Amino acid sequence: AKKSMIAKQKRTPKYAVQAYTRCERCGRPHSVIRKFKLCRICFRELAYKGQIPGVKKASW
Amino acid sequence: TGIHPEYRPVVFVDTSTDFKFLSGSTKSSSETIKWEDGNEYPLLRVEISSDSHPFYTGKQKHATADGRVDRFNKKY
Amino acid sequence: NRLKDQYLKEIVPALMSKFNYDSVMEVPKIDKIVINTGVGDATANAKVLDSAVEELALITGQKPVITKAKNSIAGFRLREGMPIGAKVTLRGERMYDFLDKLVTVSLPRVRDFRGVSKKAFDGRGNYTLGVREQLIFPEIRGMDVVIVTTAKSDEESHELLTQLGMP
Amino acid sequence: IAGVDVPREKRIVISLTYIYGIGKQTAKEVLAEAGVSEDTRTRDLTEEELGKIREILDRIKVEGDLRREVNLNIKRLIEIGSYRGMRHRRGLPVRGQNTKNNARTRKGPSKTVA
Amino acid sequence: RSLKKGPFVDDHLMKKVEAAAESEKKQVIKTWSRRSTIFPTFVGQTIAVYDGRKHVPVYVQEDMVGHKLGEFAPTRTYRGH
RNA sequence: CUGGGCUACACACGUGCUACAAUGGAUGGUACAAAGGGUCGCGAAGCCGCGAGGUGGAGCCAAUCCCAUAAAACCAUUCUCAGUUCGGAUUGUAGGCUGCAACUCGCCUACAUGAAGCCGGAAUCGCUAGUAAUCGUGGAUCAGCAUGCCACGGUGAAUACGU
Ligand SMILES: [Mg+2]
Ligand SMILES: [Zn+2]
């Protein structure tokens, strides 16, 4: 029961409070970072390749 | 005699319509009203008597505090 | 004195004209009252008995006489001569006075006083009121209030007690 | 003295608190309205404002009714059939907190295993 | 609405409770709105509140007023552990 | 799709928070940081409510404006070794905010109530210097909800013979 859900989230719900967020490369609803709209395990395996501009490993 | 605890006929009035009722009890009632000089018993504070009770003579919706009356005094 | 005044002034001729009695004293009249508490739960407690003693004394104006157990029954570990329950009798002038204090001060304080049906008569006329708490009393468990009348049946008692103003 | 033998040694601000219905804050407004100073020990009152103090408490609720009023409301919802009173009756937390662990003050001291 | 501009009686139940004045409260009202405060007009009517499994009939008294019409139908059934 | 449950409770375990007080509690005055966040956002001034908050709209796409009082520490008065002016759970009432909606099932405010607890057996854990201990601040997630999590600074030790 996933591809049904990713459709629902893109449909406007009856009351505005129901609206919520998911990653796009996945449907994962938990741990989405608002600035990039990506989950916590797309933002990792993707900022390695060098496609999230300006992001790098942080020694300090 | 002697065993019988203290007792005293007293005066009762309804606080809603002054329905005076002459009765008796063992209570002091901590009052003194000169009604019927020579029997100036203490009055006792009471609720609305059966002289004006809804079920008794005149049926009427009366709120006995709180419950249905607390709402009417804040939502309106 | 007010209740006797109303009874002899108006209630007596009212009953007489209702039933067309031969003489004056065939009219039913209130005869006695008995107050029972029934504290049978006092299987071993002692302060319960004494507390009921002052409670009923304050309600009445007389010392109650606690009653010894009629017989020893094992189902309630009841033994012979165990003082269980109390009784107080008001006769003469107390009869109307306690009634008045009940009906004008105590009875109106009943939360949902819808009265008892006419069915609760013994068939002779004597009526028992089963009151549910001691806090209804003006001064301050379940118990019974009986009424003894000179009525030959139940309907006459009903009409006279309604003449007194209560159901 | 005011309903109970409130301590003689304690200052009046503290001493009033022993009344059921007077804490640190209501006691302060009482002594401000009456006029008595806060730091008086009770053994050496004026006994004239003491008559004034009990005059004020006549207005405020005290141990007499507050004991019954709290009980006369807990005994209401336990009869109507509310969930809130159902918890009262069987001895469980009233407000909606959890009971997997850490509910002993309402539930009573922790019984042994079963 | 626990603020100063309440309360919340659902539009579904409020309309049905009003029109039940004709039936002399003989009929029942079956609504799933477990979130409507019992208005003073509700007194005397019966509501068939939902409870997860089946409706449970409640008879609105005078003293029930002020509470939410679902406060009397427990939703988890536990007995004697 | 509505309603319910993941939030149940005889009980057993793990990780944490607040405590049992005088190096302290309560009241009044009072100086000092950094790192952060903000445009379908941050929302000041003034006024009102004891309070949570309401109204109001200034300034800002920000080394410009806002969150934003740092709290411990310091100086005054008071309480006097007590189950208390310690401790704060549990409970009643009356309220505030978000959201179509706070009963199951939210966070917060005031008044009231005011429980166990008086340094904790077997046994077990962390830490070698701006470290342990102690006090506050910010952020993600987020309409709202943290005693968790990730970062930030304020005061700041004892001991290490030896395998
Ligand atoms: Mg959400
Ligand atoms: Zn993803």
Side-chain angles (χ1 to χ4, degrees), chain A residues 1-9 12-14 16-33 36-60, chain B residues 2-5 7-18 22-26 32-43 49 51-55 57-58 63 65 67 69-76, chain C residues 2-5 7-8 11-15 17 19-28 30 33-35 37-40 42 44 46 52-54 56-67 69 71-78 80-86 88-100 102-103 106-108 115 120-132 136 138 142-167, chain D residues 1-4 6-7 10-32 34-37 40-46 50-53 56-58 60 64 80-110 114, chain E residues 6-7 19-21 34-35 39-44 48-50 52-53 55 57 59 61 64-67 70 72-76 78 80-81:
Chain A
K2 192 178 208 39
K3 209 189 274 178
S4 82
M5 286 201 166
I6 307 147
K8 265 157 67 175
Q9 197 274 341
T12 71
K14 333 187 180 154
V17 164
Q18 271 91 14
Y20 73 114
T21 60
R22 327 169 82 97
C23 169
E24 4 264 67
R25 316 219 323 171
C26 320
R28 183 176 176 84
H30 271 166
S31 195
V32 56
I33 300 168
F36 314 116
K37 298 313 231 355
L38 279 175
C39 75
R40 84 177 181 71
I41 61 171
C42 281
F43 171 60
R44 202 177 96 79
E45 66 183 1
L46 191 69
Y48 285 168
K49 295 189 225 317
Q51 306 166 229
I52 308 307
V55 173
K56 53 164 295 173
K57 294 280 286 295
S59 67
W60 208 233
Chain B
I3 44 169
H4 296 313
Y7 185 85
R8 184 41 31 191
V10 297
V11 297
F12 283 20
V13 289
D14 185 15
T15 61
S16 65
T17 182
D18 309 330
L22 183 60
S23 186
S25 178
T26 195
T32 297
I33 295 88
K34 216 79 180 171
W35 166 93
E36 181 36 33
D37 300 337
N39 300 275
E40 322 89 339
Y41 313 134
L43 280 178
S49 56
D51 198 83
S52 302
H53 187 273
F55 173 83
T57 52
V69 77
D70 280 335
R71 180 175 290 171
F72 282 146
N73 301 315
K74 44 181 289 285
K75 297 290 177 65
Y76 304 126
Chain C
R2 44 171 292 111
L3 275 73
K4 292 293 188 291
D5 291 331
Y7 177 80
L8 193 65
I11 299 176
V12 165
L15 299 154
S17 200
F19 270 93
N20 302 318
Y21 285 147
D22 303 67
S23 176
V24 60
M25 72 291 291
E26 294 81 3
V27 62
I30 301 299
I33 190 167
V34 187
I35 297 285
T37 178
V39 293
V53 174
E54 70 274 15
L56 277 296
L58 294 174
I59 297 169
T60 289
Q62 305 150 356
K63 297 293 183 182
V65 169
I66 192 161
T67 301
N71 48 0
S72 64
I73 175 64
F76 314 95
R77 68 185 298 283
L78 198 66
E80 294 294 329
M82 293 177 70
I84 301 299
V88 164
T89 287
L90 283 72
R91 194 151 320 140
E93 192 66 339
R94 293 310 61 61
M95 311 162 49
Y96 80 92
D97 182 281
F98 174 26
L99 191 146
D100 186 74
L102 183 63
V103 300
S106 175
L107 287 182
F121 279 2
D122 53 19
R124 187 261 190 182
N126 295 320
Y127 187 30
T128 302
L129 265 70
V131 186
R132 282 314 96 203
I136 297 169
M143 61 79 71
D144 275 358
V145 176
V146 311
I147 295 296
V148 176
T149 76
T150 61
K152 208 210 311 179
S153 59
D154 63 358
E155 76 296 328
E156 289 188 20
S157 297
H158 182 198
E159 321 196 300
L160 62 83
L161 61 83
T162 52
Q163 282 261 316
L164 269 296
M166 321 315 148
Chain D
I1 285 305
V4 67
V6 302
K10 304 290 157 82
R11 330 186 308 147
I12 177 63
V13 178
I14 312 297
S15 184
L16 294 174
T17 300
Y18 290 91
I19 312 310
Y20 185 109
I22 310 179
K24 184 206 107 173
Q25 179 59 260
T26 43
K28 195 178 305 313
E29 73 156 51
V30 159
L31 308 194
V36 193
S37 78
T40 61
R41 311 218 78 84
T42 52
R43 305 164 323 262
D44 55 355
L45 269 184
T46 182
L50 187 143
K52 268 178 43 52
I53 284 299
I56 288 290
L57 277 296
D58 211 351
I60 318 184
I80 297 169
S82 78
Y83 161 87
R84 185 184 172 82
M86 181 195 188
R87 313 287 273 175
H88 264 299
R89 184 201 71 280
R90 48 165 54 171
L92 278 186
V94 176
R95 297 150 157 92
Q97 54 265 14
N98 295 325
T99 319
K100 202 166 201 150
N101 284 170
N102 272 331
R104 311 262 156 214
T105 307
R106 287 285 300 160
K107 200 190 286 190
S110 173
Chain E
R34 288 191 84 224
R35 64 220 190 97
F39 276 13
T41 62
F42 290 0
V43 175
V49 183
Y50 201 82
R53 255 183 279 107
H55 301 284
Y59 167 78
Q61 318 186 8
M64 293 180 183
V65 69
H67 297 309
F72 314 104
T75 59
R76 43 169 66 90
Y78 152 80
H81 192 272

